[PDB]
């Protein structure tokens, strides 16, 4: 059961220079492992078949090295269509584990998220729920923690988050702080708060509303 | 004694067949104690250790043959080691690994005895050229480099520039052929090699097959015999943990009978135990049956008759 | 050319098998061997077995021995993968790829180059329910800022996915349909946006959400208050 | 070529044996690719498709024989189809199903060649009358309708009014008998049928058995041979997914040897692959071993020798 480890857990390199990666094996695979190009929601396209030799329709720029423990995938001519979750795969031992994920991002100046928070509807009050999401939009990089509070006292077990793939044009990210309560819990409290935390935000961005304020 | 004077040569080599794991070929055939099971009967066993095989980084393939320089260097190193242990008068027990080592395991054996014969127990003929191959593996092409009659029909493969052909077409006998290419059977009928495929083994029985084999190789003149055994030459109900299993082959009984009749000539002078792959057993009990089978084959090559063996001293005292 | 076609996106509750076709075209079958590999979303790719088409060799994987069965159909070259005693950990995309038969006539191959396009398999006992879109959008009032966007939520649909467009897809700037997330009650939640500023009050925008597995459409007219 | 010109006739029929599932007999022998494994070597394979078998609703039994009209109509339809494909000069590969189809599979074969012989590889003799039966099945009674010497000792069964007896008692050879009724062995010794049960197969070996079989059927005069193979005639460690498994039978090796010696006469002119039951494997791997065994038997009938096969063109270019 050879565990295959990839040394860049994440990666963010601009359209430009080399984007060398690493896949470390637990044993000597000995020039017998492969490289893939799984774009999100697609089939993992093969990059390099056995540690080198540039499989059958790879464009011009994806040589690699290996032989025989830690193998390197080089992206010499970066070509920003190639921003895909790469994977390494041992083959010559069973069972056949893959790597972990090498999500090559896009590099831009660090954008700040647009923080806003939204109340439950009156039609929800005819259905019987409470749904408040603090939305953060067009930031870079991904890492944001968002805290919820019951007028100041923190919330758990409904606080859910969700990230997108990086946009092609502005190369940013977005995160919704998904949170759902009940109708009876909605009319109890008013000042529903959202504590954002981004690297561009030196102070935690607190965006809040009151119940029936707007 | 003259026979059963074994020099074991390990060979952890896996770049002639795709299913890796036979790097731990000698590892499992020694940790199941081939040496100590040889040391009850008077076998002067000298372990020459596993070989150090270098790892060529720029291993560019041939047209279809892939990893050719690794097999060339490994078989050259093994042929040097086998000629070393046959100048010591021992019996070269090579155990791998894969049949891509048999190039050197017979070339180094013929560096000392140029008039040998080979009993090739395999499911396959292993006689593909680099041109007639479809697999592109070198565990399927050792014999074509070793036959003298295929010179000129073999291109100069990178790594095999040292290989001088060593045996003739009428000095190799196959036992257990049941998975033969069209190209391999065309070579096998053009050169007129005396083979005993599973049709003839079922026809004659393994007694008549071994009698005709020893009459074919030793009936003209006494000469060394090089049993290059393979563990898919047996039935996969006995050796399932092998690289290319082909169903309906030699039994464990018939395999032991082949080895016992090679021993009782007193002219066995080299042995190969190839393609033992201890990671293709679906249970470890399958690996256990494979390795115990290969150990019992090796022991019956070197004197362990199933009738029993006694030391020539009085026991009734 | 060399392809593999799969069909189809199937949901099974904990119940019967997930027998998936993998039709092998272009190359000669009974000369290579198709393996199978799962992928949980946002996770790695766990290998889960390999049949040869030379002669039907089973060769399954660890942790499911057992659960998978795999056969061939080498008249019509598809390859099948069943599962037994299904469980909610098997919410994965089941790819099929070709190892090559590791017999003796089959060409050297270790490296998976036909790959099938994947198969959406979520194993859950929820029921096929229509979604329930729940936004508001005061776009564009001026509460505290100059950039007030507008967005929707999609609640309570099964199975995947919904299709959310804005003004029948005409409003295109800032369209980022957010992928789904599974609840604690085995239901799903998703969202989308566009980006106006605070200086566009006369933008009555409807998110046009369609979940065709329940075959219902919810178009939400939004008016600020 | 003259031989290996196969017309495949499927036969999904299960009303001659109780263990249903052999309706998917041709389904699994075709989805394991018998056609494409025939099409490498020069086999002009023409699939005539599975037959449409009607379902008689008022299927009243005989005294002990149950479902007799279904077997009568199915074997009449199959005998018409076999005489159709033997007027086309092909070799009738019938594959089922169960041995209740062999009535028509030999009657239609004798509508074209009235002087044939049958090599009957089964664990059982299948020679019960409707009177001497204890089972009441018709997968155990095909041969008694087909022997000419049992006319008068066969009552007019509903459905079998068309059956004219076709072969004599001395033109059928059994191989692999190991589960014989008292009534069946009384018929087998009264008619003097030359059988090779497992006593004689263990005595002589399968080489001497096939030599005496071909000398018994073809030594007098060249004539068509109809191998009516059955997959409980092999050992249940090789074909466990069959209807009536009887332990200790022919090996996969000996089964392939029977088929290869029938092929190398060049007079095989009809083949039956019966009692393949893909739902009696306790694992699907058992079904996989059964169907791969039956496919390999069929391929070795039609030219796949285990020594290998080459096309008669140069490969060393």
Numbering used by the authors:
A (entry chain E): 1 to 214
B (entry chain B), D (entry chain A): 3 to 319
C (entry chain D): 1 to 225
Q: Which sentences from the paper describe this structure?
A:
Human Arginase 1 (hArg1) is a metalloenzyme that catalyzes the hydrolysis of l-arginine to l-ornithine and urea, and modulates T-cell-mediated immune response. hArg1 is a trimeric metalloenzyme in which each monomer is ~35 kDa in size with an extended, narrow active site ~15 Å deep that is terminated by two catalytic manganese (Mn) ions 3.3 Å apart. Here we report the cryo-electron microscopy structures of potent and inhibitory anti-hArg antibodies bound to hArg1 which form distinct macromolecular complexes that are greater than 650 kDa. With local resolutions of 3.5 Å or better we unambiguously mapped epitopes and paratopes for all five antibodies and determined that the antibodies act through orthosteric and allosteric mechanisms.
MAb2 is constructed on a mouse IgG1 D265A/kappa backbone, which is more rigid and more conformationally restricted than that of mAb1. Both antibodies share identical variable regions, differing only in their constant domains. Despite these differences, all three mAbs share the same epitope, leading to identical interactions with hArg1. MAbs1-3 have prolonged HC CDR-3 loops that extend toward the opening of the hArg1 active site. Inactivation of hArg1 is achieved by the presence of Tyr104 that inserts into and sterically blocks the hArg1 active site near the exterior surface of the enzyme. Overall steric occlusion of the active site entry channel appears responsible for inhibition of hArg1. Interestingly, two classes of hArg1:mAb1 complexes that were identified during 3D classification were not present in mAb2 or mAb3 samples. The Ki for mAb1 and mAb2 against human Arg1 was 3.3 ± 0.3 nM and 5.3 ± 0.8 nM respectively.
